[PDB]
């Protein structure tokens, strides 16, 4: 198969060939819209390993988001309170730009379900992603048992709840001692620890 060669070549992002391809594709994507449709994935091996099939119902959208940190939307940079909360710059959004791109693409295409996404390019100002979406009302999707789980109403807007890969990473849903506070839900674990359990025969 060729996709092993594409994977090993995509690992080499600082080589001359991949650098040239990244530069010309970044220029083309910058000349295109912020959110547009890709006719085919520019990284077919990455799309295939994330779940894209060449089937009627799988759609690829390319998207760019502005990178950097998050500045407070406070008027004139004034935060009215204690000085420990008074910082405005050097503050960071708690989710990924990949997740932001996923939500914007999902809002663009409200009838489809966002399966996954991947990085394709970046520059100083933008990061570029290609997002894989599935059409839940397509008969091929509803008859394929490997993908018809996403037709269920519990999978509406997975990217808006953090049920994608970047959402699970940002929520820290990993087994271990390093993820004690967040492996089952941070607020749920906090509520379980902060609840007061009074029994009958106490």
């Amino acid at each position: 198969g060729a996709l092993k060669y594409l994977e090993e070549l995509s690992k080499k992002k600082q080589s001359d060939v991949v650098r040239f391809l990244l530069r010309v594709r970044c220029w083309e994507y910058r000349q295109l819209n912020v959110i547009h449709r890709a006719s085919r994935p520019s990284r077919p091996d990455k799309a295939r390993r994330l779940g894209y099939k060449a089937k009627q119902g799988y759609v690829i959208y390319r998207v760019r988001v502005r990178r950097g940190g998050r500045k407070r939307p406070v008027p004139k940079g004034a935060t009215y309170g204690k000085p420990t909360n008074q910082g405005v710059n050097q503050l960071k959004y708690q989710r990924s730009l990949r997740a932001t791109a996923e939500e914007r693409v999902g809002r663009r295409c409200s009838n489809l379900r966002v399966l996954n996404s991947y990085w394709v390019n970046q520059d100083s100002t933008y990061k570029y992603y290609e997002v894989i979406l599935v059409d839940p009302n397509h008969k091929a999707i509803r008859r394929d048992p490997r993908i018809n789980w996403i037709c269920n109403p519990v999978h509406k807007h997975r990217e808006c709840r953090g049920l994608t890969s970047t959402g699970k990473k940002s929520r820290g849903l990993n087994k271990g001692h390093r993820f004690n506070k967040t492996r089952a839900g941070r607020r749920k674990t906090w509520k379980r620890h902060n609840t007061l359990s009074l029994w009958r025969y106490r």
């Binding site: 509520k191 902060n194 609840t195 007061l196 359990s197 009074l198 029994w199 009958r200």
Partner: protein
């Protein structure tokens, strides 16, 4: 210490539904038993030993039998959950004792198992015939195959002529010597290496 410096009143949990929840659990258990009749309501679990030095004196029930245990018992891994045997692909057998105990447990279960045919018209070779399909049965495998000896027998009687001689030097001295060797395993290795290097240099 009393931790009531937060808004604790909106997360007070009262348990007035304890008997109602017990009744609901009993209803669910009886419904599951009726749906699973004549099979037992629960699956067979192996005998495992608890981790750490605090609990390794006690044995309990495990999650499922290992693939090597099923192979040595002759029960295929695709058949065991269909005849009511829990399978665990993570657990490994590092000693022969647990392997032998679980293999004997599986052989006892297979000897006491009645297998009704898929079609009553065509009884297969593994399927149990109707002549001994009728016997006194059990519904709780946790009770019928339980942990018979969780702990070792704490009292044992031996005749006076078989009293052990004992560790030479004393048990306390043996423990102190073992601790000393564990603390000095490295320094002795350095001094042996240094003596060997000095002998090699002096030829």
């Amino acid at each position: 210490n009393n931790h009531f410096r937060k808004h604790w009143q909106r997360r007070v949990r009262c348990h007035f539904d304890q008997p109602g929840k017990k009744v609901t659990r009993r209803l669910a258990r009886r419904a599951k038993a009726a749906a699973l009749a004549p099979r037992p309501v629960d699956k067979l679990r192996p005998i495992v030993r608890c981790p750490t030095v605090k609990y390794n004196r006690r044995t309990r029930l495990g999650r499922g039998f290992t693939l090597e245990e099923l192979k040595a018992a002759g029960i295929p891994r695709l058949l065991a959950p269909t005849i009511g045997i829990a399978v665990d692909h993570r657990r490994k057998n590092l000693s022969e004792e647990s392997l032998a105990a679980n293999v004997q447990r599986l052989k006892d279960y297979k000897a006491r198992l009645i297998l009704f045919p898929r079609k009553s018209n065509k009884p297969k070779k593994a399927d149990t015939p109707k002549d001994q399909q009728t016997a006194e049965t059990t519904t709780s495998l946790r009770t019928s195959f339980g942990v018979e000896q969780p702990l070792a027998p704490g009292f044992t009687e031996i005749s006076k002529s078989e009293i052990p001689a004992g560790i030479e030097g004393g048990a306390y001295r043996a423990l102190r010597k073992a601790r000393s060797d564990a603390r000095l395993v490295g320094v002795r290795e350095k001094r042996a290496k240094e003596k060997a290097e000095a002998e090699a240099n002096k030829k």
